[PDB]
Amino acid sequence: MNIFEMLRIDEGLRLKIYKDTEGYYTIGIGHLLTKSPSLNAAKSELDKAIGRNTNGVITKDEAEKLFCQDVDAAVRGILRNAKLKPVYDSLDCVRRAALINMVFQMGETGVAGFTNSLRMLQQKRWDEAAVNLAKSRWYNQTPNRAKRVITTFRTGTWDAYK
Ligand SMILES: [Cl-]
Ligand SMILES: [Cl-]
Incomplete structure (x- = not known):
């Protein structure tokens, strides 16, 4: 994966x-x-x-070409964002993917506004961050997807996706 x-x-x-x-x-x-x-x-x-x-x-x-561009742009958007980069830099490889996924779906600005969740992720307080991320419009509108992304942040594995 x-x-x-x-x-x-x-x-x-x-x-x-x-x-x-x-x-x-x-x-x-x-x-x-x-x-x-x-x-x-x-x-x-x-x-x-x-x-x-x-x-x-x-x-x-x-x-697939649009997709390539879009993934690249998401990563680059993260690296240039003062709020996001430090978070991304602190995460392991699997978790990084979860962050990219959110940016792809919602934009850098959108994610950069999950301040509290961001901090928790940065602190490696996995269960707490999972809870906080769920209190969002994102989760309420696309719950199945959000759940997969959230479990990814919680466990650091790809289990939500085998
Ligand atoms: Cl483009
Ligand atoms: Cl969904």
């Missing part, structure tokens, strides 16, 4: 534009295209991201 496989399980893979859990136009492996309600705006963003007239559909390879 690794970050790529983990996110592929959490996000799925769809080759045609779809709406995410929040109703936003997305494609591929959780690649958000836009928060606008216009499908046209989405199709436009899509063609700009792929470099061709897609007509709303992409290939597996193209989806």
Whole structure:
């Protein structure tokens, strides 16, 4: 198991534009295209991201390419964020993946705001952090996924994902 496989399980893979859990136009492996309600705006963003007239559909390879970019960007966003980096630096390899997963789903700004949880993680107070992370809109809206990520932080293993 690794970050790529983990996110592929959490996000799925769809080759045609779809709406995410929040109703936003997305494609591929959780690649958000836009928060606008216009499908046209989405199709436009899509063609700009792929470099061709897609007509709303992409290939597996193209989806995997967006995915690569997106994982890379998440890690880079973490490393450049004053609030996140120290947390990430303090964690083991498995747990790092859990943090990347959250940033991928919610953005750096989104995660950077889980101040209290962040501190607990940094202190290695696993059970406490697990509890605190659960008190969030994230957990209430996407509980199955949140549970997997939270168990990952709690145990430092990939058990939520065999
Ligand atoms: Cl991009
Ligand atoms: Cl879920």
